[PDB]
Homo-oligomer: 321 residues x 4
Amino acid sequence: PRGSHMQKKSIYVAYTGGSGHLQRQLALMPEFHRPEMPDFTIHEYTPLMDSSDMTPEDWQHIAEDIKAHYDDYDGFVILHGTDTMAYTASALSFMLENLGKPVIVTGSQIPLAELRSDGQINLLNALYVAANYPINEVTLFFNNRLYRGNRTTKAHADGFDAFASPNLPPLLEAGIHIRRLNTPPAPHGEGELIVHPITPQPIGVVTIYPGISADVVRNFLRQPVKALILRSYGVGNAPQNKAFLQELQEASDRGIVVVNLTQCMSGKVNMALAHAGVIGGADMTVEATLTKLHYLLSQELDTETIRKAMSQNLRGELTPD
Amino acid sequence: VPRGSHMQKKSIYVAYTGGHLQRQLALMPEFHRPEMPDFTIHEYTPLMDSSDMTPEDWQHIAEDIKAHYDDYDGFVILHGTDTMAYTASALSFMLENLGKPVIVTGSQIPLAELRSDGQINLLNALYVAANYPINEVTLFFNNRLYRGNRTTKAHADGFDAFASPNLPPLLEAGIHIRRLNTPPAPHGEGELIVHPITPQPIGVVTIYPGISADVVRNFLRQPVKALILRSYGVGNAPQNKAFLQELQEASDRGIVVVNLTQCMSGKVNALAHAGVIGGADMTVEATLTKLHYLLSQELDTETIRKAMSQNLRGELTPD
Amino acid sequence: KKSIYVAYTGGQLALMPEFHRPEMPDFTIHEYTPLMDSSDMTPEDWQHIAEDIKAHYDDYDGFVILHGTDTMAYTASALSFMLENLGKPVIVTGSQIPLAELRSDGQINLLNALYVAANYPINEVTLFFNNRLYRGNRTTKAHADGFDAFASPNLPPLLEAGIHIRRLNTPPAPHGEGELIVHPITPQPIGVVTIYPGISADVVRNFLRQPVKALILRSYGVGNAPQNKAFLQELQEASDRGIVVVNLTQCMSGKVNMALAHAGVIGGADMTVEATLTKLHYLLSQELDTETIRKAMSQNLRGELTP
Amino acid sequence: KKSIYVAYTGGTIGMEFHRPEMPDFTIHEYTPLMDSSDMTPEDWQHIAEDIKAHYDDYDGFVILHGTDTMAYTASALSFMLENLGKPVIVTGSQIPLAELRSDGQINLLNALYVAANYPINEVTLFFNNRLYRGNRTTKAHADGFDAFASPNLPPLLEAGIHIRRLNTPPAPHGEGELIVHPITPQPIGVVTIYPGISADVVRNFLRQPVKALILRSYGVGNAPQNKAFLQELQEASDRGIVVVNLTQCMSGKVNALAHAGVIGGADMTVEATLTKLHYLLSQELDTETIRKAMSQNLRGELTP
Ligand SMILES: NC(=O)C[C@H](N)C(=O)O
Ligand SMILES: NC(=O)C[C@H](N)C(=O)O
Ligand SMILES: NC(=O)C[C@H](N)C(=O)O
Ligand SMILES: NC(=O)C[C@H](N)C(=O)O
Ligand SMILES: N[C@@H](CC(=O)O)C(=O)O
Ligand SMILES: N[C@@H](CC(=O)O)C(=O)O
Ligand SMILES: N[C@@H](CC(=O)O)C(=O)O
Ligand SMILES: [Cl-]
Ligand SMILES: [Cl-]
Ligand SMILES: [Cl-]
Ligand SMILES: [Cl-]
């Protein structure tokens, strides 16, 4: 949407990490205080966190912070470390039902306090976008592009273009003008914001590679697994090993949700593993699939319902057949 | 990329590992023109879907190249796409004193099917092997020749299936074949030496929020001599004491722990004090195969750790 | 089983068994006489092709135009305007390497064009190259030596080919329903002026002799030229004499957003030179007054510009 | 501590910096300040002579410039400056520094930082985290922050968390005292080849006022073989006019027209070719020497 510019918006900034130094730095930067910029309020988290140290509880914290302040602001910017920004953006998309205001995750590759920082520009753009292009999704702003949150990954560890959306175009691109792209809408509810709990869930993340043993699937099966993510080859292939397919069939028998993804940057799983109870994850990222599992396992649903929900497009994270 | 002489008719050996072909090729005139090298196809028995490959299969192919080395001018390895990058990476370490091209290629669509990329990937690989005899294990796909141990299958559904995220291509094909100025890998001299491999239990942990110290403990049970960590960004992992202790325990037991980025591109830069070795800008495919190579040698733990961070074959960018 | 007409205009198949496979549509090839290097094409050649499609329209399910790459984007662009109410796909394609030469891309672009025309029909003049289908009047030859020879700078492709073929969510062109209309053209003198440091009023003055009905300006950025008083006056003198003067960007991508406007100059939005030139040949060939032509140039007729 | 000279010539940009990691810098605001769309070749001269005056007293040079003709200026400076021993970096912004979301501050900060810490002794163009060879650039994207491209050459340097020099082959590079070549007005035409072009266009440029003609031809340098066209081109060369054939395409290399006197410009941009012509026409060289020099790699502008 191209939102109206008639009244001065108020944006809430959840400074999660990524004391008082940010807020003072922004005070000192005139760009942030111009007439064309929305008003904003910073909530600095205590303690501030390196995003590498994040757990699902942290997603919950942030979602509760949004719900607390929802009626009081026009939009939300989540300032976050880059390392797991994509996991947080993906988690929020599932947790937040009936979301009728923009939530934009952003941050920087270089600290605001350093030289050549991208923080100023990413945060300025996020605020301006949240105020003027109020897309009702959890999104991620980086390097002049706004992405669907649950479509992103950090693709480039050293680049300012750190984030990609390998299976979906950006929602918006910033140049001389801000351009909205033809990207199709996610499913949308109606009424007041509902936060669905995401709790800790033991989920294993198996990379498929030559020489991987059945012992891996057997080892996960011992306890730390209610779900298992397979990063398989290409369009979702794995070794045809009888013991391997046995241990997977066994897993699904014990009520473990086994989800097949591609280890590739882009592409779509096309489903043998299906006969072993494995569910296809279509073109979902690991970040979307991990958080979607956390979401569903923490909800009031049985194993069959979770399995079916995993291949369904819930929030724009997957492209239906 | 050397621009090799055209003056005489080359002979290329084709290892058809998997991924009827010979009859199809007999039936395609382009493969038999005067400008094309002569070629000889060894069809493997059985043919393999590359998804079913194990390190033993890398060994088999390396022995195949060694057996036929003196007899041909170059080698094209026809291979399934799913694990092409692991095979290409494995060969780069296993072959030392490589004085002839070895080019891995295949297709996203079968030669028999409609709209196949097989004809053009194989035609180009043969032509390149004959005329641009780069002495490395390379991977040809979709008009680019890549350093093998720099590749991954990045695009599951695209004809541009392979990328080389941390190194430009060695060569690009258009109206003209253009060799790029990518710096050369380290090179030995004399007859080809195959460094063999034997099975090595290696874990691949992905770092993701909520991952516990009980994960590293789990790998430390029976099936692990090395652990690869797919860490965040420039090599970051949870810094909680339980996690860092499990890692130090692992290294105290002689497990080689190597820190990579889970990101498509970039370079890894705490964990060090816990015995974790940085894998710089290496792919999982390079790192996994490098470990298979190094662990199969009679090398002490300290030597393997050191060698992991060293550029042995062009797979990493030194400081 | 679909049947595709192939116009081989210039820019063997029996010796390749893939083309005759059961999955392929039926196709017929008409070899043109003479066969032409696309560098040699005149606007009348666009007419010959348009009329050839017209003759064959009712009897085939789609159309493939085999064409040299040098001016393929001009032909695609022209056909888009000349064909109105198009109800079947017309796909222009070719090769960077001659079919007779090694490593040729000709066979695979043709097979793809045939397959796509049959199985994923899009009722527009399109250009297929290197696994992508582009809107014809958004194209240019951007890469003289590459197999990815063509780009569509201001519009995503309409379709992409991998293991599967995927239609993209690219916004449709304004599309008329009804009987196919084929608009003939007649020769029109049009000049193309590139804006560059040290350009003189003389250039614009020269075109104002006797050989010009329209002038295309390839100006800087979003449509700027030096503010030289003599230059501006020559441009005003151009429009006074009924010459249609259209401002484009010389840049590969972007949108003109304009003075020149005071001098009678019309903004061409994000139109390529190829779309602008052919659109001018189209409009000038009709029974339209100068003011109606000037208005229509800035309107989106066939998906060639973004309003 | 390094000291960088900044020539503020004008442009969009003008319509952390003093922190301890930054080099010292001095800004000279030109009078008048110019929209780069208004630039004439004599303005290249004023800039080259400004760099000449300040050369000895600074470690690097940053040229602040409008984007519309930045690539023409960068290209010109590369020919006019010979034996360059310090970095000259041209940059600017798509959004005025006064406007919101401006790229001005970050392009300038980067250009200053790069000139000081990663010096490359070439006329370069810095934009959107990349440093390009000046005479290989074009403004490719009118509306984008990634405004500039270098279609036939990779960038020389890229900035991320770290700044890295890339393995781009160096330009031919003279050692010795800096030589600054003045230029003088030269009438040059630029002809685009397109279907339905007439011999009259070439005939008109042969009216009185042209010393050179640049052809933007198809593909690898083709044009229609119209007898009248080919004859007018030949007449132009007979009159001593330098006719150079370029590709109208964004990338690639030019490879009867030759029989008509036309010189192949290889993979040179229009910007490089035009300015190279201004340079060579301004020196005291035979038409034949000029014709030969046009196809030679003088400053890294073409691939031999
Ligand atoms: N973010 C992603 O999931 C990228 C890729 N599919 C991976 O397995 O890591
Ligand atoms: N091939 C690769 O290693 C890509 C990426 N670094 C990953 O962890 O999967
Ligand atoms: N095809 C094009 O028109 C590209 C660009 N606008 C040019 O002036 O050449
Ligand atoms: N800068 C350039 O020269 C791009 C392209 N060769 C053109 O003719 O416009
Ligand atoms: N490791 C840091 C990187 C950063 O954002 O500065 C984080 O993601 O929290
Ligand atoms: N799964 C197949 C894919 C292919 O190459 O066709 C393989 O890797 O062998
Ligand atoms: N010069 C040729 C190039 C080709 O298409 O093969 C043409 O455009 O007609
Ligand atoms: Cl990176
Ligand atoms: Cl893909
Ligand atoms: Cl090219
Ligand atoms: Cl643009």
